[PDB]
Amino acid sequence: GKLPPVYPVTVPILGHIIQFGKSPLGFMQECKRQLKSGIFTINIVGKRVTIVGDPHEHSRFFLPRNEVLSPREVYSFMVPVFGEGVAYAAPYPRMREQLNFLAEELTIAKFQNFVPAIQHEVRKFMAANWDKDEGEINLLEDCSTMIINTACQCLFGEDLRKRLDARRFAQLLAKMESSLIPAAVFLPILLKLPLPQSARCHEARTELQKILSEIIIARKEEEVNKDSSTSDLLSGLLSAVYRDGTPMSLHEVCGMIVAAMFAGQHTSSITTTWSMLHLMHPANVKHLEALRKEIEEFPAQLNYNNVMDEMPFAERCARESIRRDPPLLMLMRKVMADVKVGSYVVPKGDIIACSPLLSHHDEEAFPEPRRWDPERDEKVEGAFIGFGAGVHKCIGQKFGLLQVKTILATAFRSYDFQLLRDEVPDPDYHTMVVGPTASQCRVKYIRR
Ligand code: HEM
Ligand SMILES: O=C(N[C@@H](Cn1ccnc1)c1ccc(-c2ccc(F)cc2)cc1F)c1ccc(-c2nnc(-c3ccccc3)o2)cc1
């Protein structure tokens, strides 16, 4: 039919990957300018990637059903992490049941207990590691540690955290993470080759499943000897029954737990770090005042109402941090059948993408897009896609923001911070999940 315009390939069989790596946004905006089109196709190692780079057409990426646009093939490289029959490795109907089960473990009703759990871990961390009148820290490392500790304290019973503490859990997860080859998205041959990565991933997942098995057995013993019963994400998923009457296997529960941590860890840490970096910069002193005012009448011990209902401004700070520097640069689907987008047909076999980095820098949608302004609103409806939308919208958004907001309120109640450079850090685009440049994240905390 009428295909999107294709950016010229001048270096064959790499395509535009190299140019993309150098300046993701600059490159994408150059394609947009040159091809006179928000919808255009680039070439990544010989694979056509059609970018829906016009915010007016977002719904064409986000709304079509799975039969039409499917992320499953994109996620083939993560099958060893999730496990077979888990998440994108399951038929879509089955994945949806699993997602519902996960969301039910992050229901608003469970937030009643999450708030104190999170604040407990935050205080404990600050008391241990931020103990002088002032001191120097790497904010990105400290927020990452807080997020693993807080997520674990919400989601895992004490017995589990004893057998599998944050530190050990992070090691297992990092071993799985460092075994991933996202290049396999564009070079699918990799997924059929024998790779040492495969054995490491399996080692770590099996080790984790073993620990969970031993926790389940121990809990059974606790219940028999005392009436002690632990209610957590583990117990919750284990009690799940699919519509076909079968229960979730331990294999599936393990994969879901792993998948949840993989989703939640970096994104939440990065969002918290950016938010603090912005709030502490002198240019944003008005915003820091608005935050401090928002939390001023909060009890020493926050509760569900405080964080959920009484923090709209902290929430704006979080979303605008994601809006300016989205941790996920490119959302992708396999085109399963020709799809009409704007004035073009995107053909079966393409990878279709929608880029939060590109869309969040559209100047009609977000005037002066490099300026962090929590008071802004999108000027094109649906242009903010920080948490995705439609069929595959984020199910962790509320829990992620609960942690970010709780950490912001707890940190800024007791500390000020000073950046150790003139400007907030540059984003570092070399990672799967993009955050501020780590070596630029050293800051000074100052006890209030
Ligand atoms: C906290 C900051 C977070 C950001 C910025 C974020 C961002 C996103 C984005 C952009 C998508 C869309 C993916 C796509 O369209 O391909 C997404 C989907 C998803 N997110 Fe997150 N997320 C965050 C937190 C979390 C947490 C804490 C969890 C789990 C506890 C989570 C679980 C998921 C799941 C399961 C999907 C896929 C839903 C589906 O495929 O139907 N999110 N999120
Ligand atoms: O982190 C990834 N996926 C995460 C995204 N996430 C994080 C928070 N919410 C959603 C992810 C998504 C869904 C799930 C998940 C899905 C289903 C389920 F039942 C449970 C969990 C788990 C995840 F870890 C991820 C990131 C990058 C990539 C990627 N592969 N290639 C690129 C790429 C290519 C070209 C240019 C730039 C990036 O990026 C693939 C996966």
Side-chain angles (χ1 to χ4, degrees):
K2 171 186 160 86
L3 301 168
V6 185
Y7 199 71
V9 185
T10 53
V11 190
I13 288 189
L14 283 192
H16 308 107
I17 196 43
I18 292 313
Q19 303 165 68
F20 185 93
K22 269 285 153 57
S23 181
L25 178 57
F27 174 68
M28 279 188 286
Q29 284 175 329
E30 176 63 39
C31 295
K32 222 182 143 177
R33 211 175 292 112
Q34 256 236 298
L35 303 164
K36 295 174 185 167
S37 195
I39 306 154
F40 56 97
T41 304
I42 60 170
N43 182 296
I44 308 285
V45 192
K47 303 306 181 302
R48 283 171 46 86
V49 175
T50 299
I51 292 171
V52 177
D54 174 1
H56 292 284
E57 305 286 350
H58 280 174
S59 69
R60 302 300 296 141
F61 173 87
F62 294 102
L63 301 187
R65 60 179 69 255
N66 267 319
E67 283 82 7
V68 174
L69 301 183
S70 183
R72 180 202 214 104
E73 292 99 332
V74 175
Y75 274 87
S76 288
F77 79 103
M78 291 191 62
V79 163
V81 157
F82 298 142
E84 307 285 347
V86 184
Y88 298 115
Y92 323 81
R94 183 56 127 233
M95 188 185 67
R96 188 53 54 176
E97 289 186 79
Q98 290 169 353
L99 288 169
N100 293 350
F101 287 131
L102 184 45
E104 280 181 314
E105 289 309 311
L106 312 156
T107 66
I108 234 61
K110 291 177 193 282
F111 283 23
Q112 313 295 328
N113 288 319
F114 289 180
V115 170
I118 299 164
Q119 191 174 43
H120 174 84
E121 285 306 303
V122 182
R123 297 231 144 97
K124 200 167 156 199
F125 176 92
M126 298 184 170
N129 299 281
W130 296 357
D131 52 346
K132 321 282 192 169
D133 279 3
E134 60 194 65
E136 182 161 330
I137 55 163
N138 185 295
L139 188 60
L140 176 68
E141 295 184 22
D142 293 10
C143 287
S144 303
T145 310
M146 282 188 287
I147 285 287
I148 189 156
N149 300 358
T150 57
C152 288
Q153 193 76 16
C154 286
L155 299 177
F156 298 165
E158 185 170 37
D159 57 353
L160 180 40
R161 305 186 324 261
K162 273 186 158 164
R163 284 265 16 233
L164 174 57
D165 70 313
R167 188 179 132 78
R168 185 174 187 197
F169 196 26
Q171 286 168 20
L172 280 179
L173 291 163
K175 185 175 187 193
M176 307 176 91
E177 181 187 46
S178 79
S179 87
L180 297 175
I181 312 179
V185 167
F186 296 103
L187 221 42
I189 185 54
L190 284 170
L191 302 183
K192 290 153 90 162
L193 301 188
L195 307 158
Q197 282 80 15
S198 296
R200 297 197 188 96
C201 204
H202 176 81
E203 275 181 68
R205 196 178 184 291
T206 304
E207 178 171 4
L208 165 61
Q209 194 175 306
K210 172 199 187 67
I211 294 163
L212 293 183
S213 170
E214 296 167 6
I215 281 298
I216 290 166
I217 289 167
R219 312 244 265 230
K220 286 189 172 166
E221 273 146 44
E222 291 165 20
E223 289 162 24
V224 168
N225 303 357
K226 180 60 179 277
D227 216 359
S228 311
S229 66
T230 295
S231 225
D232 69 357
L233 164 72
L234 176 56
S235 70
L237 292 175
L238 281 169
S239 69
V241 191
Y242 294 113
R243 276 154 54 220
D244 81 350
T246 67
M248 203 170 297
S249 63
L250 178 61
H251 172 72
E252 285 163 352
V253 171
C254 173
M256 288 305 286
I257 288 173
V258 172
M261 291 296 145
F262 260 88
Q265 178 64 29
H266 297 311
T267 52
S268 299
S269 307
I270 283 157
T271 297
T272 306
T273 308
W274 277 123
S275 298
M276 296 183 71
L277 292 169
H278 293 301
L279 284 158
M280 79 180 66
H281 190 282
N284 299 312
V285 67
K286 297 305 260 198
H287 300 309
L288 180 60
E289 167 188 56
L291 176 64
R292 286 260 169 71
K293 170 182 198 47
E294 182 171 76
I295 72 177
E296 192 192 349
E297 310 204 322
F298 283 172
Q301 299 190 358
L302 292 171
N303 57 67
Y304 172 97
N305 291 325
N306 303 142
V307 184
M308 288 301 296
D309 294 324
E310 295 162 36
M311 293 190 72
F313 184 75
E315 174 128 348
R316 281 180 161 274
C317 294
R319 290 165 59 84
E320 168 68 354
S321 292
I322 297 169
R323 185 251 111 216
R324 188 192 184 256
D325 301 288
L328 301 167
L329 304 191
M330 296 273 305
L331 313 173
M332 289 184 293
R333 311 279 183 267
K334 194 72 182 303
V335 180
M336 308 303 292
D338 285 5
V339 285
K340 229 284 171 138
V341 185
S343 68
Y344 310 99
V345 173
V346 182
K348 187 180 184 157
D350 268 24
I351 291 167
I352 193 168
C354 192
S355 166
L357 180 68
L358 189 55
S359 300
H360 294 175
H361 288 83
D362 185 279
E363 278 168 339
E364 184 204 354
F366 300 104
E368 204 172 339
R370 286 324 284 165
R371 171 163 285 215
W372 186 78
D373 175 9
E375 304 284 14
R376 76 168 70 241
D377 309 309
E378 58 187 19
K379 289 189 163 167
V380 178
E381 191 181 327
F384 176 77
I385 44 171
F387 292 108
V391 182
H392 300 279
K393 66 167 146 294
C394 183
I395 63 162
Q397 147 172 22
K398 291 175 189 308
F399 178 69
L401 292 174
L402 186 81
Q403 294 177 95
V404 177
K405 290 157 69 182
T406 305
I407 287 164
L408 291 174
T410 304
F412 284 113
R413 169 194 192 102
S414 309
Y415 295 85
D416 286 303
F417 304 89
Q418 164 205 318
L419 249 199
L420 297 180
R421 37 182 276 140
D422 300 331
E423 310 288 306
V424 308
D426 310 313
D428 173 0
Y429 297 121
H430 300 117
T431 61
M432 254 180 52
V433 187
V434 176
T437 297
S439 64
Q440 298 173 8
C441 287
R442 301 198 65 78
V443 308
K444 175 162 105 170
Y445 73 83
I446 305 149
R447 183 55 177 280
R448 280 165 74 70

